[PDB]
Symmetry: C2
Subunit: 206 residues, 2 copies
């Protein structure tokens, strides 16, 4: 009954080094593993897939395919300091797919869980400053409404590949009740079997 | 300073109910065994250089506060209650006040007991404090950053949480610490809280040391 999976994709670098290859080769294999995880999620009725790299062209090449697959693409994180061209391509890719009803694919870029919260806080603070909001009126529901992804199903499952047992300032507010699944498998090795293994762990919690 | 490199440990103490059920006893017996395991873990932490231990109990809190406080004070433990205590009757609130004041000067372990606590709530009360200052005119919206919000959430004056331990088999935070665990090692063991002892605790610390 897994609706929203988030994944910390760790291990690209150690994978390259184990293969006796340069760091870039690990990334090439990482992108493959992303494609395969995105397909797996859409094929298995998962509503949202949120990915954290722990892109310049990765966007422009892959977007039309995602669109045709009825995938809704979103970038979460601080894109404000990205160059204005890349910001505009992100913007276009988002608007192109915004009406799609299949898998929502969130890519975290220059994202942090504390930053995420702070952005919502600044918004509420702005409302307070202009008299439209009393301090004592602020509650979890309200703050929940201006942290990223508040319009999607709650994060059910966090997967972290690569062996570390940490959130590392990924989603924080959102993972309050999420199943947390850690595997030593390196991200480029992470396949459909590993993904399903994580999904069952969620299943066997309940 | 200590070799395991762990300053602040937080524990979700789960499994009292299952423990009791395994032995054909009602829940209250698991709670009794669990209290014993709290004392044992407080002692272990104090004797192993840990600066702060933070416990999440996953009206009975009343009894505990009474009997345990004197023992804590005599072990030079500094007791703090984190969580929404405004809801409590003015007399339980009072016992909390006195317990804190009595042990505030203590230089050993700082023991934080989470009562009516939630991670999101913790964040929200910090945001209200900032909203207050905004409304007063003292604070500008765009001056709010992470470091500032950090200074308004529970336990900001103590070392960051290095290690979260959850006993009892589940692999989730359950709205325990959220802001504060951004960088913490997360350690899950199947051991039920009443059975969780010094070697289990030592095992978790060693795992933290080795995975750093
Ligand atoms: C009787 O002596 C105790 C009873 C309960 C607890 C207790 C907690 Cl969290 C506690 C510890 C220190 C100060 C105040 C309360 C506890 C809570 C949940 C399960 C088991 C024990 C400890 C000792």
């Amino acid at each position: 009954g897994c609706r929203h999976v988030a994944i910390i994709m760790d291990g690209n670098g150690r994978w390259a080094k184990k293969q006796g290859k340069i760091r870039a080769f690990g990334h090439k294999a990482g992108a493959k593993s992303v494609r395969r995880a995105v397909s797996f999620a859409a094929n298995n009725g998962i509503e949202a897939l949120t990915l954290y790299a722990f892109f310049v062209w990765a966007l422009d090449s892959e977007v039309k395919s995602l669109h045709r697959h009825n995938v809704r693409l979103r970038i979460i994180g601080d894109t404000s300091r990205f160059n204005s061209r890349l910001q505009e391509r992100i913007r276009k890719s988002e608007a192109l797919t915004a009406g799609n009803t299949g898998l929502t694919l969130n890519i975290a870029a220059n994202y942090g869980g504390r930053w995420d919260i702070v952005q919502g806080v600044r918004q509420l603070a702005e409302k307070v400053q202009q008299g439209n909001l009393q301090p004592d009126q602020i509650d979890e529901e309200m703050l929940n409404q201006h942290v990223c992804m508040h319009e999607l199903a709650p994060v059910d499952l966090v997967i972290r590949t690569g062996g570390e047992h940490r959130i590392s300032n990924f989603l924080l507010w959102q993972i309050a009740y999420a199943e947390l699944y850690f595997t030593d498998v390196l991200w480029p090795d992470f396949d459909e079997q590993d993904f399903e293994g994580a999904l069952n762990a969620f299943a066997n919690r309940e």
